[PDB]
Point group: T
Chain length 144, copies 12
């Protein structure tokens, strides 16, 4: 609910999503393999970058970012994926739903940070929103 | 004990160590801050790369790499760090001990893979050993 | 009046302005030729980029960008230039007035998008405003 | 029929085709999205470059290139596309037919320019023919 | 109090701070020399860049930036440093306090510009705030 | 059976495979064209590089590499492909089987070279094995 | 005699010549070794590129390029070299004679393609002629 | 009149023109100085490149290029400029007339080489014609 | 009169001149705007670099460079410019006179440093003289 | 005898030597062709650069550089070479003697400029001397 | 005999060989000068790199690398060359014999390190063997 | 005392100092390790470059540079360091004293070369003096 709390929960989602997409990356099979293998590598590296960005946002608010993977699992709103076989369509469907979750949270981040006069977090949140809106649009087109 | 099992436990250590050093990176304080902040970023990105490399080694053996962060926590031999205040000397002492752990495991990896005639894993293991030996030497010199 | 409508009319202006400045580029004569020839190429490529950017903004709002050149001509607020002989001073005077038009529209874009809570379009609009303010200042100095 | 007239009509086709493929680019849906989205961006930028090249050819013959988008619509032999929903196969079928049209025109350009002793336009036309022949071959293979 | 006045006083601070840190750069002594010598060069070049950025912001508001160094000294809120011997710790303490001053002013810049509907200055101010927040955090960690 | 003999037969396979995949590259048709056309170009250039590498290995053992294409055809274990129409799936199936053949041979190369104390050929063979294992894994995933 | 037939026979010559010069490259001995070793690597890579270029020319005429090395040996006008010992002077003498052969064929290619109105093959042929004329001139100077 | 004779006279013109424009470059005065100083450096380096290109064309025809500056002065159709004071307008007027001379000669080069079946010189001549046509157009626009 | 004193007064001139030309840069108006705006940015950055170079020369002589802007104003021989409106011709006239001043001082620097056997300052001074002589020549040509 | 006179005569030598070595470049024959062809291209481009450098030195002294090739022939101390057949050894012998001539002149340049207090020409002359001494040493070693 | 002892003696050879080839580099005379001068610079820089690599291998074994040049002379198996005149053929003969010495030692290094389970030194040794085998082959071809 | 003798003794110092700092590089321990390890690598590579530069200066005077490491030890004025344990402060103290020695010698080099009219060695010596003065200043600041 507070800005740093939204950030910390997003940092948890970021690494959990990194792991989820890492799973997809190595376990994707079928005629779409080559495209999905490449796309998922880009997607999980973006989540790795987001993890780093969010940590930076947290310290500048005078708080500690995630300390452990145990803490990431605690705070995450993302369900971890235990399956190792999917079809490529289901991979993109899953990632889309996760992006939609993130968009909702970054919207809340922006609004909450604005109310506190936290101009830097607002900028960061709005920039992430632009990236997410593009990713969502492309996955929606792919799945249409 | 089997090659793929050593690899999977190392993949678990890799991401746990990534997280541990990420913690150090953001929480380091004192006159050594600037050097340790930079060094730890390089160190955690190396563990992130190792995580990826090990996943690749696992699939080529016909097995699944780590599926979840929960699975990483299960398999890891590394204790997760919950503290958020250290002195820079203790950070390097900790990382050194972790490197020493990894060196022992990559030695075992190389030996085990050789016994199975797994030439590619041997090459990978021996290459990692070279990197670890350099990191260990430098931390030992720093702490001498 | 709605955000997507402002965007679509701006996309129309963008390509019409691209064409207008393309005309200037090839038809400029006189001792200022070399500077104006180069400047106008940069200016029309900026309008080409704007055309692309605006299309991206439109799809993310769930609408279709411009479909045809006929549609661009319909929606544009910019008068198309049929002359093929100008003096370089009149070229810069014309472009300045077009920039001023665009600035007014991007101001309206920013305000309208803000009212709808469209954070991404606001960022885009404000970024374009910065570019336009620089272009306007330089043309005003040139013509002073 | 004269060289400059062929060039001017081709310049009209170039920007109309730029717009047509820009439409395809943003409106493509389905499992082929990512490949077609990328390919169409390359294709429309090629038509944008062709537009520029043709303008250069026109001025060197002592004539004015296209002045307005209205003039492009007047001179074009290409039907503008008002639809906003296609399947990816139909996009490539359409572009192929347009390439075939262009090849016929650039053939005529080369022959006409040769008859007038316009060596530079011949070179330009023959170079464009090489590009078109490659594009056509690849689309034909894709659709076979 | 007005946006252009805040900008002009900040431009004065920027060059005065450039000079102050230039002084530190050349006069730093002791075992920290090499790190501080390098860091201060980066810091003073950032203030030189800020000086330029602020001048650009001023002209776009229709005002004149600083005309002379005499004018910079008049408008500055920063005390000029006449000492030529410091310890490296005091250098970082001083720079931190200056950054804190700048952060307060850029906050005021952002708020004031927002009230006037000056969207471009707001963006500029908020971007500078992000840079300052990072610099402050790192110096605070170093000094903790 | 001797190291240089394995190398020479592999050099023969390399150029024969280069040619086979060159055939696939130009003759592939269908909706997968663009991906297969690109992939096969990379694959045949890898076989061209392998051809060169193997020649280098042969001379360092004091023997002559392949002298003629006639000699390559003589020594090869690979059947030359006379067909000019395939479906993309069959192309990848074929290449996979060829990779599997190569992996078996490079395994034998490594083992044989080790027995002779030829350390350099062992390194070369094991490095090629790593490349082949990756290629095989990806084709197997694609075809699963 | 037909354009595609000239192209196919040239494609055969290209790979046969690649192989011939590859032979020279690895088997050259004597005080000229270092210069000839380097020059021959450049020469055989040029023949490899020519092989690719000619295949592209063939498909655009609606025909199949070379399918197998057996087919290259069938169609080639170049004698394969079975010797493994030469002097560097004889290497350059041989390559010169091969270049002269190619020049004659590319001349015929250009003339034949022109008669059929194949503008693209003419351009390609004339471009190759320029390269060959340079290579021939330099070898003639070397041997004078 | 023969191809090699046209080439040799053009090589003479090239270096004489290099010298003429070198003179302009260093002796230009007035408010246009900076633009003309830069433009003339580009122009004289182009003539230096042309000098080299023409020499290459001559040797491939089995003839000797220019041996001495005395020979260049003998063969040139260009009047050498002894003045050291001009106005920038007269510089561009002069260069334009020289370009026009060159265009006429390269036209004759192309036609003459075509009659002899010298395909490579034709290509070279036509390529130079394209460059000259652009230079002429721009100078004509500048002077209009 | 002493080497370090000449250097310190030149360092004062350098930053004062940086400021003077910064003023010109932002306040230039008229048809020459674009060229003068660009040229003045290069000129003021050169003075900024000179400021740095001179500081380095001072410390190597065992003295302190300028401590404050107040000290720069004290030591400078350059009049600060309070005007904000000039014509471009007067800008270049002013800068020329300043360059001439600097040339006289760097001449004195070189001579004085030579008398003291200060070889490094001589080299530095003579290198600056070369730069100044070029700048002066070009401005004199522009104004002729 | 005066500095500007030495410079002007050297500028004449520079272009005459450019031409002489250009002659060598295109007319060299024999087993050394490839090395001499390359070396002479580097050598003549160095003389072309020297020509430019010397012109710059002349204008900064308030004089006109060479106006025409006729003037270069007048002032040169270098004999123009009319032969078109040499052996590679004689080419290097000739160039060596020319370098030796230049070294003597640049020595005189340095001494004369020093006497006039022309610090910039001294620096230029001494820098050229370093280049010449290296070239001479290498040619002497080659010919030993 | 122990791994670290082999390494230390090789480090001694490395710098002694660096010096020997440095001698050759500067003292080579005759028509082969330019090729040998260049080749020897590459060769001595390789020995300089080897010197560094071996030092790194030594410290990782917990020992001190060479402390002094006196120690290098003590441990080396390479005879230092006091002559200053050779023919280029004798230079390559000498270097070949030194390479052969090194190959024998790196073979022993690899075998000895393997027996101790020193996987990293084995990798290093085998990699050096590959480089040496290439160098030896090329020198043998040159001298054949 | 003669120029070539000063150069030869400096070449001896250069490689001895290279070795001394190489020793420091690998044997440095303690909290300053990372900075000193890096700095010393840069320092010893500078001495390696100096070694090369001095050899070049010697041959251009018609003399032989150092032939052997034995000769370097003979001529050096630098004491070789046999210790393998130091503290980082003592490393910088030692290097400073060596730099001071070099500065004295390069001063003598410059003066001696000037007396002989050796302009090139003077330039070289004065350039080295500039580098040394910077290195000395920084080490003095570090140790203050």
């Amino acid at each position: 609910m507070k800005t740093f709390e939204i950030l910390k929960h997003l940092q948890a989602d970021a690494i959990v999503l990194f792991m989820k997409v890492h799973n997809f990356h190595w376990n994707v099979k079928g005629t779409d393999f080559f495209n999905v293998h490449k796309a998922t590598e880009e997607i999980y590296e973006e989540f790795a970058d987001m993890f780093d960005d969010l940590a930076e946002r947290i310290v500048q608010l005078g708080h500690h970012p995630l300390v452990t993977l145990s803490e990431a699992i605690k705070l995450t709103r993302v369900k971890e994926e235990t399956k190792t076989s999917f079809h490529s369509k289901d991979i993109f469907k899953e990632i889309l739903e996760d992006y939609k979750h993130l968009e909702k949270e970054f919207k809340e981040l922006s609004n909450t940070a604005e109310k506190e006069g936290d101009k830097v977090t607002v900028t960061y949140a709005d920039d992430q929103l632009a990236k997410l809106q593009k990713s969502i649009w492309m996955l929606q087109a792919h799945l249409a």
